[PDB]
């Protein structure tokens, strides 16, 4: 047959690329020598094209102007801190070790100094649970208990823009506009609606996959479609 859409994606051609030349910045935490003697002031709030959420421009003492992953409740004029001794307040960044248990945080680093990997989407947040000298236990947005190096930095509070998902797109045109700001091919043609040559589910007088949808983890690309290695399907049981 012909390569399926999922395979065309990988070549990274324009149709599948994100409009990076239009993106603003990668909200990674600032790098501090130590001391925590680094503070800045929120100079403005902006829209982040890549995440459909707001971001805050901060001017730091040492003259560095950078965009930051803003939690809810950060406004212009406010002063933020980044360091071990940073004050424990919304919008401030410091290593999990310094963060008091039971405090919601976002933009959590995976490995100390990486800049932040977890809980960055609209209105989300990780929940710092257990402390220790060897491991900090955080509960990520998906509900998974994650063991992290207490040296991993994080921002106090939940991410701005919460509830974005509560409003329906209502029309195709709205979906359209959002999709144009992401690395995605949209709209979506169902596999069952294509010719046999174009997809494992194509072909047949009437539409229907001529096979079970749960595909094995070991299936090669081109064949791994439908419900990948599902542990189960449906709503029952």
Q: Residue 211 interacts with Mg ion (CB under 5 A)?
A: no
Interaction residues for Mg ion, span 173-192 (CB under 5 A): 180, 188, 190
**Closest residue to bound Mg ion by CB:** 26
Phi, psi of 35 (to 5 degrees): 75, -35
Q: Residue 236 interacts with Sr ion (CB under 5 A)?
A: yes
- Shortest distance (Å) from residue 132 CB to Sr ion: 27
Q: Residue 183 interacts with Sr ion (CB under 5 A)?
A: no
Cβ closest to Sr ion, residue 135 vs residue 141: 141
- Shortest distance (Å) from residue 98 CB to Mg ion: 22
Interaction residues for RNA, span 35-54 (CB under 7 A): 50-51
Cβ closest to Sr ion, residue 120 vs residue 131: 120
- Shortest distance (Å) from residue 64 CB to RNA: 14
Among 203, 213, 215, 224, binds Sr ion (CB under 5 A): 203
Cα–chain-centroid distance for residue 91? 18
Give whole-number Cα distances, 222 to 2, 6, 141, 169, 213, in Å.
Answer: 9, 8, 32, 31, 14
- Shortest distance (Å) from residue 22 CB to Mg ion: 11
Q: Residue 85 interacts with RNA (CB under 7 A)?
A: no
Determine the Cα–Cα distance for residues 156 and 72; give it in Å rounded to an integer: 10
- Shortest distance (Å) from residue 88 CB to RNA: 22
Closest listed residue to residue 149, CA positions, set 108, 107, 120: 108
CA quadruple 137, 118, 69, 150: dihedral, nearest 10: 30
Q: Residue 204 interacts with Sr ion (CB under 5 A)?
A: yes
Determine the Cα–Cα distance for residues 100 and 173; give it in Å rounded to an integer: 45
Site string for RNA, 164-203 (x = CB under 7 A): xx----------------xxx---x-xxxx--xx-xxx-x
Among 110, 207, 214, 233, binds Mg ion (CB under 5 A): 207
Residues binding Mg ion (CB under 5 A): 1, 26-28, 180, 188, 190, 207-208
């Amino acid at each position: 047959g012909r390569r399926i859409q999922g395979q065309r994606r990988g070549r990274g051609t324009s149709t599948f690329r994100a409009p990076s030349h239009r993106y603003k910045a990668d909200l990674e935490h600032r790098k501090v020598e130590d001391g925590d003697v680094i503070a800045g002031t929120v100079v403005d709030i902006e829209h982040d094209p890549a995440r459909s959420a707001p971001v805050a421009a901060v001017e730091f003492e040492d003259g560095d102007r950078r965009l930051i992953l803003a939690p809810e409740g950060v406004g212009v004029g406010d002063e933020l801190q980044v360091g071990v001794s940073a004050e424990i307040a919304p919008g401030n960044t410091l290593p999990l070790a310094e963060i008091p248990e039971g405090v919601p945080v976002c933009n959590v680093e995976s490995s100390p100094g990486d800049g932040g990997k977890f809980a960055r989407a609209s209105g989300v947040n990780a929940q710092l649970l257990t402390h220790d000298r060897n491991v900090a236990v955080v509960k990520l947005p998906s509900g998974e208990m994650k063991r992290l190096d207490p040296q991993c930095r994080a921002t106090i509070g939940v991410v701005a823009g919460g509830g974005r998902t509560d409003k329906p797109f209502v029309k195709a045109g709205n979906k359209h506009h959002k999709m144009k700001a992401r690395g995605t091919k949209w709209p979506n043609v169902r596999g069952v609606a294509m010719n046999a040559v174009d997809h494992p589910f194509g072909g047949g007088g009437r539409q229907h996959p001529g096979k079970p949808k749960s595909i094995s983890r070991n299936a090669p690309p081109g064949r791994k479609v439908g419900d990948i290695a599902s542990k189960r399907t449906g709503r029952g049981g």
